[PDB]
Amino acid sequence: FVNQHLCGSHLVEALYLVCGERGFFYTPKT
Amino acid sequence: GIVEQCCTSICSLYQLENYCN
């Protein structure tokens, strides 16, 4: 599910699944 | 940043993990 174009909620979903309990930061303007 | 690498271009696990805490 990671090796494709991921935009919007689809990208934050991928971050959520990959990063697990570590969590993540989503900075679309940076 | 993440949008350029993963939305505009094709994403990768390597890149996603750069945004994990």
Side-chain angles (χ1 to χ4, degrees), chain A residues 2-7 11 14-15 18-19 22-25 27-28 30, chain B residues 1-4 6-13 16-21:
Chain A
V2 165
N3 304 290
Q4 60 189 317
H5 294 275
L6 295 174
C7 306
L11 181 50
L15 284 165
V18 161
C19 299
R22 312 169 263 180
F24 62 88
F25 49 100
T27 54
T30 291
Chain B
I2 197 174
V3 171
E4 293 68 40
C6 284
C7 179
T8 307
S9 305
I10 296 165
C11 203
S12 67
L13 180 57
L16 283 173
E17 284 199 332
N18 283 335
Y19 299 94
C20 304
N21 299 308

